[PDB]
Amino acid sequence: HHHHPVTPCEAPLQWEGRIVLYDHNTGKNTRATVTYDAILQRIRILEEKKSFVPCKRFFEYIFLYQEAVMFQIEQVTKICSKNTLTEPWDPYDIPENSTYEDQYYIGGPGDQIPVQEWSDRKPARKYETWVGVYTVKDCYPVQETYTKNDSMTTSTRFFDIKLGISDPSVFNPPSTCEAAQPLLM
Amino acid sequence: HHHHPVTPCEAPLQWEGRIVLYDHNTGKNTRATVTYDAILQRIRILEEKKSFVPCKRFFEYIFLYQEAVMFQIEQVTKICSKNTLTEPWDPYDIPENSTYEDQYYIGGPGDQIPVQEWSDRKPARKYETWVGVYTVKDCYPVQETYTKNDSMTTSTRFFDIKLGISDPSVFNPPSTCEAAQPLLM
Ligand SMILES: [Ca+2]
Ligand SMILES: [Ca+2]
Ligand SMILES: [Cl-]
Ligand SMILES: [Cl-]
Ligand SMILES: [Cl-]
Ligand SMILES: [Cl-]
Ligand SMILES: [Ir+4]
């Protein structure tokens, strides 16, 4: 008998890593290099081009939540958009009041890792809007599903995570962002 | 005035590296990981698959010139061919009697490398059948063009070369080569 943990582990506050964003609404899998900083509430997201995908435009996003602004740079053409942020900062961590779902091992004999699953499950709602899988040892994000705001659901996978920000230069918006608010999409 | 060098540098005898084979006769660019051993006169060549090339079969070649045999393994299906070698061993080096052509730098200010060009040029023949480019410092192969045997010409580029054979296991033919001489092509 293992004690149901009273609160979730604390996710790391700063890291450089890579994600896949699976958007169910359009079926698109966006691959990205991420710089994540829950202390200054900024996140920088660089989309990746793969061989022979049939879209031609790739974006860098710099979310600066402490200055209420997001910059979106078309990577090739360097066209920059500057937009106001209305929405609060949302960390990649387990909220304090989350429901404990389970603990299990991912992978094989010898090469396997213990992880935990948390959710926002509560008896009043049939369906969860949030599920997070996090390592037991270091509380690193592994996967999140997020059903939020009338039924736009995303699935995020996280990998190659490295504690710390070895390159803070990425949060400086480029010279071209003396700029306006386009919808680039 | 630099003295015309009396003999070419001596190419390294053993290395692991990668090549591109450009065959003019068919236009095909074959990318390969190579294990090269001029002492035991063996060479092992592993073709590389790239995303969405329209051929489906990729070969490992183990040339054992000291036992007069070559093994060709279809990589996925592991079908093995065992063939006799009639042809003598040919090293990746500059033959002793080669004509000196030139010395120059490849690349830019700060990031540039000095290399030499040798050939089999002689006044009796209008066209060279062999041209080799080799580093000045270490005599590493950079590029060869080979017009030999009625006008089948190949161009080879060499890169990521590492002195020594850190993995001799590659010269052991697989369990499936209790086997016969197919033409796989
Ligand atoms: Ca969150
Ligand atoms: Ca040769
Ligand atoms: Cl790719
Ligand atoms: Cl790739
Ligand atoms: Cl590829
Ligand atoms: Cl690739
Ligand atoms: Ir690729």
Closest by alpha carbon to A170, among A66, A63, A57? A63
Q: Which long-range contacts (CB under 8 A, 24 or more apart) does B96-100 make?
A: B96/B7, B96/B8, B98/B8, B98/B130, B98/B132, B100/B4, B100/B5, B100/B8
Cα torsion B78, B79, B82, B87 to 10°: value is: -80
Q: Which of B82, B76, B40 is nearest to B61 (CA)?
A: B82
Output the CA A50–ligand 5 centroid distance in Å: 9
What DSSP state is assigned to residue B138?
Answer: T
| Single-letter amino acid, residue A182 | P
Which one of the ligands is nearest to B51 CA?
5
Report CA(B155)–ligand 2 centroid distance (Å): 12
Minimal-distance CA residue of chain A relative to B51: A51
Measured distance CA(B170)–CA(B179) in Å, rounded: 18
> Burial code of A122-158, b = ≥16 C-beta within 10 A, e = fewer?
eeeeeeeebbbbbbeeebbbbbbbbbeeeeeeeebbb
- Residues in chain B with CB shorter than 8 Å from the CB of A52 are 51-52
How far, in Å, from the CA of B141 to the mean position of ligand 2? 10
Q: Which residues touch B135 (CB under 8 Å, ≥6 apart)?
A: B113, B114, B115, B116, B142
Method of determination used here = X-ray
**A127 has a chain B CB within 8 A of its CB:** no
Closest C-alpha among A107, A100, A109 to residue A132: A100
- Ligand 4 center–CA A51 separation, angstroms: 6
Closest CA to B11 of B141, B110, B103, B136: B141
Per this entry, what is the length of chain B? 185
CB A170 within 8 A of CB A44: yes
CB distance B99 to B116 below 8 Å: no
CB B118 within 8 A of CB B104: no
Distance from CA of B114 to the nearest CA of A (A): 34
Nearest to A118 by CA among A144, A151, A155: A144
Kindly state whether B51 is in contact with chain A, defined as any CB-CB distance less than 8 angstroms. yes
Place of tokens 């400086």: A172
Q: What is the resolution of this structure in A?
A: 2.4
Hey, what are B76's tokens?
Answer: 């996925």
For every residue of A89-149, DSSP letters joined together read P--SS--TTPEEEEEEEEE-SSSEEEEEEEE---TT-SS-SEEEEEETTT--EEEEEE-TT
CA distance A75 to chain B (A): 23
Distance CA A22, CA A34 (A): 15
- Which of chain A's residues have a Cβ under 8 Å away from the Cβ of B50? 51
- Which residues of A fall within a CB distance of 8 Å from B52? 51-52
B129 alpha carbon, distance to own chain's centre = 16
Instruction: Using a CB–CB cutoff of 8 Å, tell me whether A54 touches chain B.
Output: no
Residues 6+ apart with CB under 8 A from B65: B41, B42, B85, B88, B89
What are the structural domain ranges in chain B? 14-171
Classify domain B14-171 at the CATH topology level: outer membrane lipoprotein receptor (LolB), chain A (2.50.20)
Count interface pairs A-B at CB distance under 8 A. 6
Longest C-alpha distance within chain A, in Å?
A: 60
| A185 three-state secondary structure | coil
